[PDB]
Design a protein around this ligand. Sequence first.
Ligand SMILES: N#Cc1c(-c2ccc3ccn(C[C@@H]4CCCN(Cc5ccccc5)C4)c3c2)n[nH]c1N
Ligand SMILES: N#Cc1c(-c2ccc3ccn(C[C@H]4CCCN(Cc5ccccc5)C4)c3c2)n[nH]c1N
Lengths: 220, 205
Amino acid sequence: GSMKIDVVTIFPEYLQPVRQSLPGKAIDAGLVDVAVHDLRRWTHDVHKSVDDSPYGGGPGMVMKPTVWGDALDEICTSETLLVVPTPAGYPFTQETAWQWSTEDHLVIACGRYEGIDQRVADDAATRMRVREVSIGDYVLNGGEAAALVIIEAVLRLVPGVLGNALSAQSLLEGPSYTRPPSWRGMDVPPVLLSGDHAKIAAWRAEQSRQRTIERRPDLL
Amino acid sequence: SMKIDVVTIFPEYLQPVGLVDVAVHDLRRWTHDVHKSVDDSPYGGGPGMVMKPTVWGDALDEICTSETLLVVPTPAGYPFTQETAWQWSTEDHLVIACGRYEGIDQRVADDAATRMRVREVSIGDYVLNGGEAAALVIIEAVLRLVPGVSLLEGPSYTRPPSWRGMDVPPVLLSGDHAKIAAWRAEQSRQRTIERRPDLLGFDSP
Ligand SMILES: N#Cc1c(-c2ccc3ccn(C[C@@H]4CCCN(Cc5ccccc5)C4)c3c2)n[nH]c1N
Ligand SMILES: N#Cc1c(-c2ccc3ccn(C[C@H]4CCCN(Cc5ccccc5)C4)c3c2)n[nH]c1N
């Protein structure tokens, strides 16, 4: 019904699209709150260091456990769902989005560089639910774009939060058409204007089958 | 060198965003009538509205050339993967057509395909409210590969060597490159089998 989301990142400005997406009515009805925190608030030194060289060598730096530990200590409780984007994560899917849409408090820990010292998530997992997840099989610069995707996929399932409706309606969806009935020599498929709604449903099912075979045979 | 143009009715969403440039275009600028919406009801019925091909056609005609790669985010697309990102990294010009509502009339992609290369793609098996988040993801994955710009990664550690009573795995402190490479390989294997068995040719859970 309602959800608080905290995002922790060294680039809080990158979360701006979430602010752009939130309707005033959802916030005012106390259905949702999204806070974004600069990780550097929890640094210890004058140079505001968030990263350090990896033990055992390697490319790039690793984010410091003492900084992340302090941040999450302040922001999380035992009731928090701690979400950690990572390309080494479990797959984030629509099932995941449905499961998380009923949560009361999500905290999303956005990494950069070569990620966060593993002890941060391992320690957190001894007193809260922790989920390392990936939004897809490509490489990003950090967790922030993944946070945008996760927040949208989850909040659109919370009634009234993003302004979208949830329709009554596995296989891929087939093609959709609207006015005008003819455009650049292409007519809308006549069956859609036939008023035979059993035939229309069969036509759409076959379109879905063909599209799935062509684009996502893994689903069959 | 790459130009990316993004076309959207929600340009406000996309402004986190020399070898590369990215421009965002408001689709509504190409409207045929200010008092008319870009969306209409679906032929044959359905949930939700569909974006009309007319406004899209006018916008894309102005922005694209025959050399353009037209990218259309859609949950019903081919999978967008790292191999896709490598393939697109050497393109001169990407145009990303972001839909909203229940999507874009199919004739937009079908007509464009008669004059340029078109790619309908999905960034993952979850549902979004529109193509803009997908556009951000595609841009990020592709731009980091532009010239001049199998297994899951195991865990990483940095200082201090003991933290809250949790020790960095001793092998990582050993200086022994061969033992470290072996331990890391074993960690990656274990992680991949548990989290992404599909990558190693096994059944998903
Ligand atoms: N979800 C998701 C993602 C992410 C994602 C998520 C979080 C971070 C933090 C840093 N990076 C960027 C590096 C750049 C170099 C290579 N690897 C190194 C790395 C390996 C293992 C763990 C952390 C980093 C990613 C991230 C990427 N990418 N793709 C997805 N579907
Ligand atoms: N890439 C990518 C995407 C997108 C994406 C991309 C482009 C558009 C344009 C519009 N939408 C939103 C629609 C898309 C389809 C139908 N549902 C409505 C629906 C409502 C109720 C019950 C079932 C379904 C929403 C888009 C979503 N989503 N996930 C990805 N990996």
